[PDB]
Design a protein around this nucleic acid. Sequence first.
RNA 1: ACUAACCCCUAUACCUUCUGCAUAAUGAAUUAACUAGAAAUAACUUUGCAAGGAGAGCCAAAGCUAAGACCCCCGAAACC
Lengths: 87, 85, 110, 41, 252, 95, 291, 107, 97
Amino acid sequence: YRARPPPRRRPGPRWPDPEDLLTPRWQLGPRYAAKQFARYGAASGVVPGSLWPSPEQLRELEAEEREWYPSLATMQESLRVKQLAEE
Amino acid sequence: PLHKYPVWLWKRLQLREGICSRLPGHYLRSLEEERTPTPVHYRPHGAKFKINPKNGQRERVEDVPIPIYFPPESQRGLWGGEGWI
Amino acid sequence: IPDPPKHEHYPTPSGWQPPRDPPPNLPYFVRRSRMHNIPVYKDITHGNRQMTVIRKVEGDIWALQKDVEDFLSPLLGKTPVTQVNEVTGTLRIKGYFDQELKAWLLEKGF
Amino acid sequence: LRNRVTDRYFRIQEVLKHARHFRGRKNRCYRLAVRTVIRAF
Amino acid sequence: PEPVLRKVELPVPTHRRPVQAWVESLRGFEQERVGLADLHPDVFATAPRLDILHQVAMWQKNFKRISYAKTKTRAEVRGGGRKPWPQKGTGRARHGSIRSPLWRGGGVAHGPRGPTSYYYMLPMKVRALGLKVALTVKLAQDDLHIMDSLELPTGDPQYLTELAHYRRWGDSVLLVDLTHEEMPQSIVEATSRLKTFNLIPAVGLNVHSMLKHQTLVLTLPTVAFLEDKLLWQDSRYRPLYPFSLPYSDFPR
Amino acid sequence: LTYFSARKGKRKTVKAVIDRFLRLHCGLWVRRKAGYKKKLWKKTPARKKRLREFVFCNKTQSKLLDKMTTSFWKRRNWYVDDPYQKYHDRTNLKV
Amino acid sequence: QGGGARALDLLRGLPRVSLANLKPNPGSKKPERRPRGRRRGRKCGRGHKGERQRGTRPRLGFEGGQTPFYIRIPKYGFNEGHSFRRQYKPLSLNRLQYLIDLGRVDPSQPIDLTQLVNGRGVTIQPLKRDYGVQLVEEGADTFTAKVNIEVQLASELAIAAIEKNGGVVTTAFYDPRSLDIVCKPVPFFLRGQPIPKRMLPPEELVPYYTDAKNRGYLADPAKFPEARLELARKYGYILPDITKDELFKMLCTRKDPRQIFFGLAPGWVVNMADKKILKPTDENLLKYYTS
Amino acid sequence: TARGTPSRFLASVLHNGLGRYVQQLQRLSFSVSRDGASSRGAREFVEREVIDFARRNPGVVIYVNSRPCCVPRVVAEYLNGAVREESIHCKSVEEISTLVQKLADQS
Amino acid sequence: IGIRLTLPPPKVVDRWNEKRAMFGVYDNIGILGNFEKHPKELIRGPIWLRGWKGNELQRCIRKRKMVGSRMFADDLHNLNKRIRYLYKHFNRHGKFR
RNA sequence: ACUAACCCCUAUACCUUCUGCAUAAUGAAUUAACUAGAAAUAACUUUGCAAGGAGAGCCAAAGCUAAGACCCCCGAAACC
Ligand SMILES: [Mg+2]
Ligand SMILES: [Mg+2]
Ligand SMILES: [Mg+2]
Ligand SMILES: [Mg+2]
């Protein structure tokens, strides 16, 4: 006999049906598209501009880091104050 | 055997067929939406992250709504979102 | 794995030295591992049984066994207890002798 | 895979043959014959 | 004419020498001795590890097996939720259900609970080492033949069988070529109607097929493909991430 | 002890032993002494002294604690300035 | 020489190997035991009637009613906060010398966490609370190599040994978010996300990385020369003038504190499929990635 | 047991050995399969020993039939008419030789 | 009694049909295909039994957690009961502790 | 054993429960079919590689991966 063709990974990105219920939600978000663009490059059709966060999500991204990640000067001043307190 | 679709998908599936499929689009979209209600019987945390006093670590917190029972008589009144607990 | 670079002097500061070229004219031969190291390891079982093993051996393994106990008899005081496995090309010695055997196998050209 | 014994007839015949010359039901009933064959042996 | 000569492209250890194999061709009945090919000693002349072959073949057969046998327990047999008779006073044995394993028509105490999987993976180097052992065994038993290409003068299947019989190849021969899309037309039509003769690509080569078929034949590109793929195993780092991800030198 | 969890199907860990015992990577277990903070006024200084060390467990207790603890706590840790770093390996141990 | 030839030649006279003549290696398959027959059938190794025979034994650690041994032991803070303690995989000078001698690490180029894991010198598990590597002083006598190494932690003797041979050692901090990126850049690039800037060290670690004696990456460079002289004087080795070395440019090559790799500004996107680098131009994006 | 098994008195055949000894074995028939692991011991036995055994006992006729079979067998016939059938299913060579030699001495 | 009085009909097996003659092909696709495919991906069978192995208890959770919402009402109830019984038997019964 | 069925001599049914049962302690009229040991934490044995092992994660001061091999059946009065 002759063997069936070897099972190869299907070339090209996979874009499922957004209106179909059985398609899992993790294949519809921008994270899925970002992964597709990285693997397949410009041939995936994903706009490179959409990779960087839009200004709508940047405002809380900097708000979160300002509130949760203090600057070097703020940390040094806090450390110096604590050093004086224990001294 | 196994169902083609999950059971919780059945209610959505019938909305796409029959007389329900001929309903106006704007009404269908409004009914499909499942936005959360304003908290009434519980106090929201108000922050995405909080510091645990026990270990001084930052962990994510969530607001879990408390189930509310609405008696059929409340449909004839305006309780403002309150109900039986 | 990248092939080791050639140093103008040997052995290297870490103690590594390339195998001698041409290989020694012996009935048996021992080849370095994929990391270019002598295949000598320590084995322990039951928490008290200590063995030294020699891997990657092809040829007359019995000649290697004869040479091993000849080299180890003056050090240990009697003929060492050894196990010969022909199918896997490995040699097992009771006790810990890795640092002497590595030194012994190094100067033989392996 | 369901496995069932298929040679039980021969397994009991090797015992019944030693009791063929006995008396009573213990020469043909395996349950009785096995107990007396052991005593005879 | 001009003989075909194949050398070993990968470096050979100094203490080992290449093993020579004859090169034939299928364009004629008597077209053997076309040339000589040099094989890597570490692939076609390794240790005859029969235990490696047995465990690799057993791994291949039993790793894709799924058993669908399943029997109902006493909790799945219909009915049997009522005590038949009172515990005492009836003069018969006590029971709590009519679907117990003791009862006729009841459940099964310890039966199959399918579907069940037997999937397990051998170490990657062991599976590769199994292919090297099988090739070495084939060379040592003189049932392995080396060809240049798999073009046939005619697509007649009976011609191929007669050629194999004349050369005393064996009852069954496993044919291996480079890529599925490079099959010559003659070899495809000849082997499609044959049972003991099978044609598979290089990627499809396996120990179980080699053991099942008495005779194995390979092309020169197949030999180089097998030499490159196998010799990458014994000189390589431990994988930081799966090899499907891009690497500095993978694919070669 | 939960040999197979209902959500993951894997062995669990008894948190009681974690809060009371410390395991060295060599297999030894380190524990405190019972009643070392109870009724200190009625105990002699020598008794109080020997009550406040860290002592090892025997073979049976070590096997008992290993079975109640998953493999996560048996790994080798590289904590910075760890006080018990020098005790994680045995030196000059024969048989 | 002869063992392989003898084994292979002996194979020639043997019959053809097939599927009907294979067996496992001896000692590799312990036969399964079944509770059948006189030997293992009467009680199946369960003993006489009781809890053990009926398989209703109490839970592990239960001694039949008395207070459990593990319960009666008082609690102590042995493993408190263990999931928050910092861990560093130790790196020895012998291992570094072993890597350099075998060529697995290139000394002519700057060496950091990415280079060490690429050469398989160390294994990092950020999910296991790892925070990088520490350079230990083991085998400092036999170490002789001029390298530029970047490690999260270092000892005073390890620094002295590196600087004795004219090398440069610095200490830098990597947050857990970017530590996984540094060890495995390839999986991160497949995520399709712009390169983020690494966070500053925590408040407790700020003094460590701002001190010249620790060779911190945030310390004052002007305080370095006096620190090196003190180490050279203490250990009695003459401090070489590496400014006159031909590799002075390579030694001075250090990454920005907010940078991850070398020559890759935060916010860039790597496209391995088409071998391209994409950089943003929005002024808000540029300010975020550079501040 | 003895009570469940017929018995006989000790005796010989035609006072064998009184004037001369006559070998009681008269015929041997061997069934051997060309292919099959069960006949390997039987096969190698006739490669090296059946020739020497034939010369040792000239009054015994040996038949070697090669046919497909699952259980190799040997059949021994004596002058008194007794027939003995022994299986050679998966035995070695040194033990079939002892088995074959035993039938020769039997009366 | 208990045994057949006639020989069962002989069985004929084709040792060289399509399936037998090519069993094991492409099982080394990962080694010989630049690791673009895994032999586990060649597994054909139940959704919850593709490249995974475990005891009976573990198979029940995996089936329930992945396809439990699609099972029939009677089957789901029996599966829930099986998990409860298996959990009790494994965690509370046995010769060893 | 015997020439010989019996006659001669010798011999206190089986399982289970108990220190101890021919026991007058339980179970079994007989035949056929059905009917009861499920798991890999550690350790042991055997391959592969080796200061590295593993087809992301995990472990490692000779270890890592893989395989083999140990954990029964029926029966309540009850509760919701
Ligand atoms: Mg070991
Ligand atoms: Mg009921
Ligand atoms: Mg009941
Ligand atoms: Mg028993």
